[PDB]
Design an enzyme around this catalytic site. Structure first.
Site, PDB file in Angstrom:
ATOM      1  NE  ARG A 151      35.117  33.756  29.542  1.00 52.16           N
ATOM      2  CZ  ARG A 151      34.897  34.326  30.720  1.00 52.16           C
ATOM      3  NH1 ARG A 151      35.288  35.565  30.972  1.00 52.16           N
ATOM      4  NH2 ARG A 151      34.264  33.635  31.667  1.00 52.16           N
ATOM      5  NE  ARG A 255      37.992  38.724  42.287  1.00 52.30           N
ATOM      6  CZ  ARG A 255      37.985  38.170  43.491  1.00 52.30           C
ATOM      7  NH1 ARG A 255      37.279  37.084  43.747  1.00 52.30           N
ATOM      8  NH2 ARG A 255      38.700  38.727  44.465  1.00 52.30           N
ATOM      9  N   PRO A 328      48.344  42.612  43.035  1.00 55.95           N
ATOM     10  CG  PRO A 328      46.621  44.122  43.459  1.00 55.95           C
ATOM     11  CD  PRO A 328      47.083  43.099  42.452  1.00 55.95           C
ATOM     12  CG  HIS A 356      42.487  43.567  50.857  1.00 55.54           C
ATOM     13  ND1 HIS A 356      41.926  42.739  51.805  1.00 55.54           N
ATOM     14  CD2 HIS A 356      43.033  42.751  49.924  1.00 55.54           C
ATOM     15  CE1 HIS A 356      42.125  41.478  51.465  1.00 55.54           C
ATOM     16  NE2 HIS A 356      42.792  41.456  50.323  1.00 55.54           N
ATOM     17  CD  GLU A 357      46.976  42.972  48.924  1.00 51.57           C
ATOM     18  OE1 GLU A 357      47.733  42.328  49.680  1.00 51.57           O
ATOM     19  OE2 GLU A 357      46.278  42.433  48.038  1.00 51.57           O
ATOM     20  CG  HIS A 360      46.452  40.606  53.222  1.00 52.18           C
ATOM     21  ND1 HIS A 360      45.349  40.049  53.833  1.00 52.18           N
ATOM     22  CD2 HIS A 360      46.240  40.486  51.890  1.00 52.18           C
ATOM     23  CE1 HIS A 360      44.512  39.604  52.911  1.00 52.18           C
ATOM     24  NE2 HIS A 360      45.026  39.863  51.722  1.00 52.18           N
ATOM     25  CD1 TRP A 459      32.282  28.811  32.227  1.00 49.64           C
ATOM     26  CD2 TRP A 459      32.824  28.271  34.331  1.00 49.64           C
ATOM     27  NE1 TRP A 459      32.820  29.928  32.819  1.00 49.64           N
ATOM     28  CE2 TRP A 459      33.159  29.624  34.112  1.00 49.64           C
ATOM     29  CE3 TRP A 459      33.075  27.710  35.587  1.00 49.64           C
ATOM     30  CZ2 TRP A 459      33.729  30.421  35.102  1.00 49.64           C
ATOM     31  CZ3 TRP A 459      33.642  28.503  36.568  1.00 49.64           C
ATOM     32  CH2 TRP A 459      33.962  29.843  36.320  1.00 49.64           C
ATOM     33  CE  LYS A 463      31.034  33.012  34.929  1.00 46.92           C
ATOM     34  NZ  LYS A 463      30.662  34.454  34.863  1.00 46.92           N
ATOM     35  CG  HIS A 487      42.084  34.086  42.167  1.00 43.40           C
ATOM     36  ND1 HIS A 487      41.872  35.180  41.357  1.00 43.40           N
ATOM     37  CD2 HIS A 487      42.314  34.576  43.409  1.00 43.40           C
ATOM     38  CE1 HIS A 487      41.974  36.284  42.075  1.00 43.40           C
ATOM     39  NE2 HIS A 487      42.241  35.945  43.323  1.00 43.40           N
TER      40      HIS A 487
HETATM   41 ZN   LIG Z   1      44.199  39.983  49.787  1.00 42.66          ZN
END
Ligand SMILES: [Zn+2]
Ligand SMILES: *[C@@H]1O[C@H](CO)[C@@H](O)[C@H](O)[C@H]1NC(C)=O
Ligand SMILES: *[C@@H]1O[C@H](CO)[C@@H](O)[C@H](O)[C@H]1NC(C)=O
Ligand SMILES: *[C@@H]1O[C@H](CO)[C@@H](O)[C@H](O)[C@H]1NC(C)=O
Ligand SMILES: *[C@@H]1O[C@H](CO)[C@@H](O)[C@H](O)[C@H]1NC(C)=O
Ligand SMILES: *[C@@H]1O[C@H](CO)[C@@H](O)[C@H](O)[C@H]1NC(C)=O
Ligand SMILES: *[C@@H]1O[C@H](CO)[C@@H](O)[C@H](O)[C@H]1NC(C)=O
Lengths: 596, 209
Positions: A151, A255, A328, A356-357, A360, A459, A463, A487
């Site tokens: 960071r 996360r 992924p 999961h994928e 998709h 931030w 948090k 992201h």
């Molecule tokens: Zn996904």
């Protein structure tokens, strides 16, 4: 003739002449994401520019046809998307800098290497290493080093680029009839044509906060139970009243709390729901993981993976010979080409994400019949929720016993379900405060409520208050920690993941009613139920054509996200957590810091 | 000493095993006559993806007699092979090649890919996207004339004047729906006039005079 019919033949020319142009861009982008080479970065960018050029020219021609004349609503959606001016409103000065910044931030995140303070030649990269440190190490200093160095050495360099990213992106959204760049992302959930099924940009922001208010009590007792069990793992470093240090959580950012299961497992002696050990000990391959996920979709009636999937996909790290983007990724290249790119390692995490994928892809394969501009999910959450429906059924101990990763004489128990429900809660419940805070920060920063001088203060102010996570080391405004996540640095909407979870149990509740069920919302393996599969197929086949509110209503019975199914799934855990916190403090103090 | 056959075997290996086929908008037509036709070789090739003999019998096709035999060849996408069928509406059938709703005969197709989608493809096939009217059965239009959406002056490729023809882009990575498929249609027909081709066993039934 009618302009509506005149526009129908315009779209017919567009759909037939756009597939090859988009396919060439997808092929080149695939050849770079699987093979990092300066030759491929130029070829991929050239094909994207030609694809973007085709968008610009066919957009201008689409402006002539007026939407108010068209009465076929499916036609209206296709014309509406093509008419929109995106980065075209920006000047050549603005568009170049916006793209130059966007690629620069991605390359800093991708090429981010933190050198060991001793022996500077030794450098640890976030993807291969420095995540194993942040997910397997119990040394407070080792976690502190990896958390702070990333960071600081990587995050700080992204601070100047993100400031100009916000102002240029805001100018793009503000020009194209939006309040801020947050509104550009927020429009994905908007319906404005059908009575009773309409939606707005801000209805998402109010429903999210209303739904999150009923997730806070469950999070509090999960927080307290994790806090107490992390206190033993890291003695003399966590306060029984204060927040949780960020580096002591599951991953680099907090996360997902999945990796904390080892420390916080309720009943250790019961057979592990984390079948990661079982897979490795049985010589499970990357192929088996995707093949077993294939059989799951086959059992509910959905089609096999195409031969282009098995021939052309990349399911392992290609090796040190050639670099690759090992995030992924599910690829709908077009032309019937469906591929999955993933750095599959033999772990339960990659077993579930393979489901999961492939979820998709099953969505992608279903809406392939729909036209090109309707070839997308109802909203962002729908696509990410479809994969999570499978991983919710696949993670059940009964399904694990079915595939052989659990003992054939496994006896269900009160204790095992708490073991199973807790692990599912660390992954699902834990991330909800993280996502709500991260998007609320970005939404407000785009709105300007948070000044540039109060960026990092807000931030970590939020948090602590929202997520209950504290900074291990004080941070200036030089740091840019929000962009240390993939992201944020790669310009993707993140509220899709919060909406995903609430949809996921809503779908599963309905899918597990079609598949005749007996007990609670967990132990819900829709495996071998064709009725459950065909109930989803109908939603997947629609794509963007029908409104998401209507699409949700036909599947589950509601036009909005409902937090009730999620709480019923975890209700046995919520009551157990409250008893397990009788002699523990529930809640966090906003003024405790390890450095203080 | 040799065994003489006054009617040689009909040229069926010519059309099917041909090196190059034609785009659907310019399909190729062939007449088979003055010969003897063994349709067993058509059954014996198990590589044929679809053998849809509407009307006449599938395996007793060999045990028949015919007068007018026309063979039409073209290549289309796998998901568009269905449009080469009686009474099916689609872009290929409406504007490129239409079978009669009363059609009797067969439709034959196979996977292609090996030859007509070669790495760095030497050929290029095409198809017709727009037309004013739906084609009548067994009709062809090779028109390069532009199409108008509204009342349009189509002398220049413009915003509402669209070039009628479009190109197939066949690649190995494409899916089965978007992979090339070679189609040959045999248009068997019966005429009250003297016959032209019957079959191997029936050399004296109606094929000879
Ligand atoms: Zn996904
Ligand atoms: C990687 O890309 C280069 C050029 O872009 C190419 O020559 C090379 O063969 C590729 N490597 C693999 C393993 O495909
Ligand atoms: C809109 O136009 C398409 C054109 O193919 C048609 O199929 C569809 O039925 C029309 N919409 C409605 C609601 O009928
Ligand atoms: C796109 O820009 C043009 C002017 O360049 C404008 O007339 C048009 O309304 C814009 N379209 C949208 C959807 O904002
Ligand atoms: C799926 O693929 C497997 C292996 O190729 C095959 O055995 C199975 O029959 C296939 N199922 C369907 C429905 O095509
Ligand atoms: C689905 O059915 C097959 C066939 O009997 C069986 O082997 C498999 O265990 C079933 N799946 C589950 C999850 O029980
Ligand atoms: C095409 O050629 C192959 C190889 O020579 C042969 O086996 C096959 O019978 C031929 N098919 C026809 C219809 O002539």
């Amino acid at each position: 003739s009618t302009i509506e019919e005149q526009a129908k033949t315009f779209l017919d020319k567009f759909n037939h002449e756009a597939e090859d142009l988009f396919y060439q861009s997808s092929l080149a982008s695939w050849n770079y994401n699987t093979n990092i080479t300066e030759e491929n970065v130029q070829n991929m960018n050239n094909a994207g520019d030609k694809w973007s050029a085709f968008l610009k020219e066919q957009s201008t021609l689409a402006q002539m046809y007026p939407l108010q004349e068209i009465q076929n609503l499916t036609v209206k959606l296709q014309l509406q998307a093509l008419q929109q001016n995106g980065s075209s409103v920006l000047s050549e000065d603005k568009s170049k800098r916006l793209n130059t910044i966007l690629n620069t931030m991605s390359t800093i995140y991708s090429t981010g290497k933190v050198c060991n303070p001793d022996n500077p030649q030794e450098c640890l990269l976030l993807e291969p290493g420095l995540n194993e440190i942040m997910a397997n190490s119990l040394d407070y200093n080792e976690r502190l080093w990896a958390w702070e160095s990333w960071r600081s050495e990587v995050g700080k360099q992204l601070r100047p680029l993100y400031e100009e990213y916000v102002v240029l992106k805001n100018e793009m959204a503000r020009a194209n009839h939006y309040e801020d760049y947050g509104d550009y992302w927020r429009g994905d959930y908007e319906v404005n044509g059908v009575d009773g099924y309409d939606y707005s940009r801000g209805q998402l922001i109010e429903d999210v906060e209303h739904t999150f208010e009923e997730i806070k009590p469950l999070y509090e007792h999960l927080h307290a139970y994790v806090r107490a069990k992390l206190m033993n793992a890291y003695p003399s470093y966590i306060s029984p009243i204060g927040c949780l240090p960020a580096h002591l959580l599951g991953d680099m950012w907090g996360r997902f709390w999945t990796n904390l299961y080892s420390l916080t497992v309720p009943f250790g002696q019961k057979p592990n729901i984390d079948v990661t050990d079982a897979m490795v000990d049985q010589a499970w391959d990357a192929q088996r993981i995707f093949k077993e996920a294939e059989k799951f979709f086959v059992s509910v009636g959905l089609p096999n993976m195409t031969q282009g999937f098995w021939e052309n996909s990349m399911l392992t790290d290609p090796g040190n010979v050639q670099k690759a983007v090992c995030h992924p990724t599910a690829w709908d290249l077009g032309k019937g080409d469906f591929r999955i790119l993933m750095c599959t390692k033999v772990t339960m995490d990659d077993f579930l994400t393979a489901h999961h994928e492939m979820g998709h892809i099953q969505y992608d394969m279903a809406y392939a019949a729909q036209p090109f501009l309707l070839r997308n999910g109802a909203n962002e959450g729908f696509h990410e929720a479809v994969g999570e429906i499978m991983s919710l059924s696949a993670a059940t101990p009964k399904h694990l016993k079915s595939i052989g990763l659990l003992s054939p004489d496994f006896q269900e128990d009160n204790e095992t379900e708490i073991n199973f429900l807790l692990k599912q809660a660390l992954t699902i419940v834990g991330t909800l405060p993280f996502t709500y805070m991260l998007e609320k920060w970005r939404w407000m920063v785009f709105k300007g409520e948070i000044p540039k001088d109060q960026w990092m203060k807000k931030w970590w102010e939020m948090k602590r208050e929202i997520v209950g996570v504290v900074e291990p080391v004080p941070h200036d405004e030089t740091y840019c920690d929000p962009a240390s996540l993939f992201h944020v640095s790669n310009d993707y909407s993140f509220i899709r993941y919060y909406t995903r979870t609430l949809y996921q149990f809503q779908f599963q509740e309905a899918l597990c009613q079609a598949a005749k069920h007996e007990g609670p919302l967990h132990k819900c393996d829709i495996s071998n139920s064709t009725e459950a599969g065909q109930k989803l197929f109908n939603m997947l086949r629609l794509g963007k054509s029908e409104p998401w509110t209507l699409a949700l209503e036909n599947v589950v019975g509601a036009k909005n996200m409902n937090v009730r199914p999620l709480l019923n799934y975890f209700e046995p855990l919520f009551t157990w957590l409250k008893d397990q916190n009788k002699n523990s403090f529930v809640g966090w103090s906003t003024d405790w810091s390890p450095y203080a | 000493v040799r065994f003489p056959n006054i009617t040689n075997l009909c040229p069926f290996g010519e059309v099917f095993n041909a090196t190059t086929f034609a785009s659907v908008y310019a399909w190729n037509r062939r007449r088979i006559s003055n010969c003897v036709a063994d349709y067993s070789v058509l059954y014996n090739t198990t590589s044929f993806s679809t053998f849809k003999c509407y009307g006449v019998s599938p395996t007793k096709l060999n045990d028949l007699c015919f007068t007018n035999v026309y063979a039409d060849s073209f290549v289309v996408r796998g998901d568009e092979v269905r449009q080469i069928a009686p009474g099916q509406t689609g872009k290929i059938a409406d504007y490129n090649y239409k079978l009669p709703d009363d059609f009797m005969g067969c439709v034959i197709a196979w996977n292609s890919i090996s030859l007509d989608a070669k790495v760095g493809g030497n050929y290029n096939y095409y198809y017709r996207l727009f037309r004013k009217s739906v084609l009548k059965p067994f009709e062809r239009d090779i028109s390069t004339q532009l199409y108008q959406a509204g009342d349009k002056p189509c002398s220049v490729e413009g915003p509402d004047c669209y070039y009628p023809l479009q190109s197939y882009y066949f690649q190995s990575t494409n899916g089965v729906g978007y992979q090339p498929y070679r189609v040959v249609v045999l248009s068997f027909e019966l005429l009250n006039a003297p016959a032209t081709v019957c079959g191997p066993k029936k050399s004296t039934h109606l094929v000879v005079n």
